[PDB]
Design a binder for this molecule. Sequence first.
Ligand SMILES: *[C@@H]1O[C@H](CO)[C@@H](O)[C@H](O)[C@H]1NC(C)=O
Ligand SMILES: *[C@@H]1O[C@H](CO)[C@@H](O)[C@H](O)[C@H]1NC(C)=O
Ligand SMILES: *[C@@H]1O[C@H](CO)[C@@H](O)[C@H](O)[C@H]1NC(C)=O
Ligand SMILES: *[C@@H]1O[C@H](CO)[C@@H](O)[C@H](O)[C@H]1NC(C)=O
Ligand SMILES: *[C@@H]1O[C@H](CO)[C@@H](O)[C@H](O)[C@H]1NC(C)=O
Ligand SMILES: [Cl-]
Ligand SMILES: [Cl-]
Ligand code: NA
Length: 656
Amino acid sequence: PQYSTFHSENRDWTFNHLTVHRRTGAVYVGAINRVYKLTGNLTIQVAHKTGPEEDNKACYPPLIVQPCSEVLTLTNNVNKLLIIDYSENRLLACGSLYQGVCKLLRLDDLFILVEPSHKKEHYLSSVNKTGTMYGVIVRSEGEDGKLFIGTAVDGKQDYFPTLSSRKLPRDPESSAMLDYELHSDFVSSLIKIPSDTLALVSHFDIFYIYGFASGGFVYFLTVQPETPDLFYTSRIVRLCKDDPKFHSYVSLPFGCTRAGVEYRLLQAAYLAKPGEALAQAFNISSDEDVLFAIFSKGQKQYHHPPDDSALCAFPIRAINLQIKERLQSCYHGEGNLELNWLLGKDVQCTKAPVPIDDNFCGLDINQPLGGSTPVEGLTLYTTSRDRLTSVASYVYNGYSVVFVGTKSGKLKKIRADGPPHGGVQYEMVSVFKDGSPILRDMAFSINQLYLYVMSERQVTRVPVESCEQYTTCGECLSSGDPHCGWCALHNMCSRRDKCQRAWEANRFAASISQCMSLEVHPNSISVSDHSRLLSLVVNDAPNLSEGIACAFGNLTEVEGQVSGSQVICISPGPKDVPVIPLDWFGLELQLRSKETGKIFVSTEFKFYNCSAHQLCLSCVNSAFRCHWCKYRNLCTHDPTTCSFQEGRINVSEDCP
Ligand SMILES: *[C@@H]1O[C@H](CO)[C@@H](O)[C@H](O)[C@H]1NC(C)=O
Ligand SMILES: *[C@@H]1O[C@H](CO)[C@@H](O)[C@H](O)[C@H]1NC(C)=O
Ligand SMILES: *[C@@H]1O[C@H](CO)[C@@H](O)[C@H](O)[C@H]1NC(C)=O
Ligand SMILES: *[C@@H]1O[C@H](CO)[C@@H](O)[C@H](O)[C@H]1NC(C)=O
Ligand SMILES: *[C@@H]1O[C@H](CO)[C@@H](O)[C@H](O)[C@H]1NC(C)=O
Ligand SMILES: [Cl-]
Ligand SMILES: [Cl-]
Ligand code: NA
């Protein structure tokens, strides 16, 4: 029962992030003091060292720019960001060490290509806590490359922008590597947290949980304290892929609701395709993007979110639409921009006869833009105690399958259907024996047979499917597991492509109705009536012509005669018939395929003892075919053994 696994070199060097190379299958783990490159089965190939190093967070600029007067401590370098830059066959890794500098590593050997560190913005943030920074690389065909990066700033609002866009030139040795995409006094590709907002509210900060590119936009999902107990707000922040001025900035709350509970604290997210049921539920094409998200109940307890948590789905289209409607109503002069932490105050929308296209990327007016009314997601599934902590999803055979990690190291497999049910958990695996919470980063092997999952101490490769755990066609085809069918002749629950000869008639059942059944006649015989010929019919069967054998429980196995779906077998002989405990005795009559060697169907077969009854009424009312011999004064299965034909009694009505 043991999956492939990789452990941290040390109990304090916890794992942070994880990514799999879509083309190579190479596995990259971002950890404290280490960046690891691993094989598919999690065999380490390269261990790139990133720490520890003597440092102090008070040291700004960093030690690599300036000598520091502060006392230094050997400091752990937390992986804050880990992203594959596919176009350029390299990996971007940014730690917490030295105010959050970054490295570019070559994919094959993790040899350092460059480490930008002369410019102020080359330092992303001194924050040493995971789950607070996220990046997205965007490189079209005619562009050298771009990096969007959002991060908590820890109150150092003048040191670090909370969101920005940087140059990711193709050439590693470019002097402009990681420079602001645009940098001027009052127009830059960056957002800074106003000093007045930290003054008003501390410890005000903005946490970037997830980010993604979809269509012509980038999206960041954030949590931050609300501004005039502490209440937090989870938001969708959108920008156009092509907008140095950051004029396209817009920000809406989001979350979801079910059964009298509001889930507003964002925990995790993952962009995927809908699957057929959600596509219909959402009225979108099956290859449009859907955001799968985990939220905890309420808007409080950010550092220790309630156990009560939910898996929700947001179609990107529904998001863009609610954003467009917001833009439109603002450019009609309705209401305010409503983004107090940034604008600092109430700013009124400006009416202007500008057409708001699907791909409107902002102007000078009416930006940045907030809003109060939340984007509501579709709640798929909820839990009450084993708090959900991560999420990944993909589509198998038109079914959206969602994997959800829990705080106790469990992995749930949810099958997504639209309303009215939403989602159905069809399995839960125990992944980490130590009960360690599952971290946010999960990723599939290149052909989606496995899902890589991590705790702070461990990376584990978990099979997407374990169909063989279902041992009857009934269990298999009612599990609700999209991967699982019944391999008829091998008596096995498996993937179609794992079932030999699946393409041949009735070899593979995809539906409970396609499960074989077995009819026997007669379905019961007198114990004294041995060596009977029985007629077995196999419903919904495949070719049996290779050969069939009949097994009478443990007692017997004889070669059957096969004609289509009909089998004829000889019942056990005198020595082999079972003895009855004092009226009958049941057992499973089974067919073994000679082609495969496996028992694949069964049904009950009963032996009875008419002699067991010693009174006419008892004999006659037997569940089995018994006859009372009036004169011989006994019960029998064979009426021709009564003394006279006149002695035969079959019904109780004429019992003496
Ligand atoms: C699996 O494990 C062995 C251990 O050395 C390794 O050689 C092999 O490359 C691994 N297979 C993969 C995932 O490529
Ligand atoms: C983050 O900073 C705090 C400051 O007190 C420190 O205690 C903690 O160990 C740090 N986490 C790291 C460097 O792993
Ligand atoms: C999606 O849903 C709406 C409402 O049912 C429908 O009018 C529309 O035609 C559907 N798809 C298209 C073509 O936009
Ligand atoms: C067959 O079944 C009987 C009980 O029904 C058992 O006592 C016997 O050991 C079994 N024979 C085997 C397993 O070969
Ligand atoms: C039928 O029942 C009688 C007892 O009523 C018993 O003596 C006889 O052995 C039974 N036949 C069996 C169990 O084979
Ligand atoms: Cl808290
Ligand atoms: Cl179900
Ligand atoms: Na069939």
